[PDB]
Amino acid sequence: DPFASTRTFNLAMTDIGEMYFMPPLMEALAQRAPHIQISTLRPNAGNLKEDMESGAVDLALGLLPELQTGFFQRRLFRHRYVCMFRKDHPSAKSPMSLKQFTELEHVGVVALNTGHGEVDGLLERAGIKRRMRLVVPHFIAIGPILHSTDLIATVPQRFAVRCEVPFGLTTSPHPAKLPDIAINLFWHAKYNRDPGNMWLRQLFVELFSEAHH
Amino acid sequence: DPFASTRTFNLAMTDIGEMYFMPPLMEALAQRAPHIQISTLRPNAGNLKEDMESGAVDLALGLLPELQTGFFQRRLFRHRYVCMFRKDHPSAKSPMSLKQFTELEHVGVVALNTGHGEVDGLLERAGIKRRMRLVVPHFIAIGPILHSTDLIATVPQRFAVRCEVPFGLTTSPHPAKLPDIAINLFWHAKYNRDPGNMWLRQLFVELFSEA
Numbered sequence: 001d002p003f004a005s006t007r008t009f010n011l012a013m014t015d016i017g018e019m020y021f022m023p024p025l026m027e028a029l030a031q032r033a034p035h036i037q038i039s040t041l042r043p044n045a046g047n048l049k050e051d052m053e054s055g056a057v058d059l060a061l062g063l064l065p066e067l068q069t070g071f072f073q074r075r076l077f078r079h080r081y082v083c084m085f086r087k088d089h090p091s092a093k094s095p096m097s098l099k100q101f102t103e104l105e106h107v108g109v110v111a112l113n114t115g116h117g118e119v120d121g122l123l124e125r126a127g128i129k130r131r132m133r134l135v136v137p138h139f140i141a142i143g144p145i146l147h148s149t150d151l152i153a154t155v156p157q158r159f160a161v162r163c164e165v166p167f168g169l170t171t172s173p174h175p176a177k178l179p180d181i182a183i184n185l186f187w188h189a190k191y192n193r194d195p196g197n198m199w200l201r202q203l204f205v206e207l208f209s210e211a212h213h
Numbered sequence: 214d215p216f217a218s219t220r221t222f223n224l225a226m227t228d229i230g231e232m233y234f235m236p237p238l239m240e241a242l243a244q245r246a247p248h249i250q251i252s253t254l255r256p257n258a259g260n261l262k263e264d265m266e267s268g269a270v271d272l273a274l275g276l277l278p279e280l281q282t283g284f285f286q287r288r289l290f291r292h293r294y295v296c297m298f299r300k301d302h303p304s305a306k307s308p309m310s311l312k313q314f315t316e317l318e319h320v321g322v323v324a325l326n327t328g329h330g331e332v333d334g335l336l337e338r339a340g341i342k343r344r345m346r347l348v349v350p351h352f353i354a355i356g357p358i359l360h361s362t363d364l365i366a367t368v369p370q371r372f373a374v375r376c377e378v379p380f381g382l383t384t385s386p387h388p389a390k391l392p393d394i395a396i397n398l399f400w401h402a403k404y405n406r407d408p409g410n411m412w413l414r415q416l417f418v419e420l421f422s423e424a
């Protein structure tokens with residue numbers, strides 16, 4: 001049944017999603033359905049809405065404003081933005097003050113087709129105009145960049161904690177008031193009742209849902 | 214007038230390019246041109262050739278055979294593909310044999326609009342069939358994924374070497390016959406004499422060219 005499938009599922013997610021969702025998913029699949037193949041793609045890859053409609057993309061994961069309307073969507077968890085910097089930073093402290101946040105230099109991330117791109121506008125509207133020497137499209141490059149510079153960054157908490165040891169970095173709670181990050185699972189009405197889709201949806205829900213309350 | 218420039222330069226490069234190029238560039242810029250901004254994008258974002266022509270993208274860095282004719286270029290350095298897997302993998306050995314390579318499960322990297330996209334085809338044509346359990350679009354997530362699974366991957370060596378300690382990975386010379394990876398810097402002829410472009414190109418050559 002589930003054990004036997006050799007179906008390939010295609011999943012849209014960010015690079016954080018790849019490092020976060022893939023290892024436990026692979027571990028679960030080796031226990032439960034060891035022949036299933038998984039392919040990922042970034043939320044910006046083509047025509048996400050069209051590709052979910054046609055069935056080329058089975059599921060989408062993340063903070064995804066594109067799909068806020070015509071799609072089924074289930075919340076997996078919430079987490080916050082934190083500030084991150086190298087463990088031996090010459091001046092950065094935790095907790096970091098707004099003043100210090102505005103004094104330091106930043107690397108920014110433009111996560112295309114995600115809601116993370118609201119961050120710069122939200123800070124700007126609060127009067128926090130960062131000295132941002134570098135802007136990159138995506139998140140994982142942030143680890144090595146912070147490891148070998150005095151830059152700081154604003155990043156999702158669940159990504160940050162995964163960088164602390166590998167890249168020798170520390171986090172601070174974020175001095176600015178930023179909304180919570182809702183990481184959701186999305187699917188198109190067409191596959192609402194497809195057995196294989198429901199099974200993979202249920203697995204994501206089981207593996208990744210916040211113990212709510 | 215480098216020190217006073219507030220120019221934003223738009224650079225096309227991979228996730229590997231960002232981790233490798235950006236920290237020394239960041240350090241040089243703080244010292245020579247602290248008001249310059251650098252914005253990156255992937256080689257696959259929009260269409261590279263037109264954007265370099267328009268000055269939408271100033272410079273491209275990486276393995277980019279589509280720019281190999283009709284663009285200016287300088288070689289920065291060369292390196293090879295290697296096989297990478299977690300240090301305590303139950304069976305994977307270094308050096309890995311081609312037989313073992315064909316037996317183990319892989320994480321593939323599709324790698325669009327770079328030369329790395331060709332790996333699947335050189336292997337497939339040579340008759341080296343891989344059991345591809347997981348496919349991702351880009352390289353940089355391979356580090357965390359190998360660390361926490363039993364998969365193996367084929368990856369650029371200079372990238373692989375930066376993963377070894379952070380993620381507890383080992384490498385092997387690659388059992389298959391694969392081409393060298395030439396990492397070049399490219400620009401369009403139109404900006405050949407643009408002063409800010411010349412200045413930044415020359416900074417990349419200074420910091421990264423082994424030639």
Ligand SMILES: O=C(O)c1ccccc1O
Nearest residue numbers: 014016017020062156158
């Ligand atoms: O921002 C995301 O896409 C994300 C994905 C998985 C886990 C945490 C995250 O912030």
Ligand SMILES: O=C(O)c1ccccc1O
Nearest residue numbers: 001002005007195196199
């Ligand atoms: O349609 C499938 O191949 C399938 C896959 C996983 C679980 C249940 C299924 O029917």
Ligand SMILES: O=C(O)c1ccccc1O
Nearest residue numbers: 227229230233275276369
């Ligand atoms: O593949 C790349 O684009 C690359 C870039 C910088 C250093 C090593 C690399 O392989």
Ligand SMILES: O=C(O)c1ccccc1O
Nearest residue numbers: 214215218220408409412
């Ligand atoms: O001439 C410019 O516009 C310029 C900009 C940045 C760095 C060096 C430069 O000459």
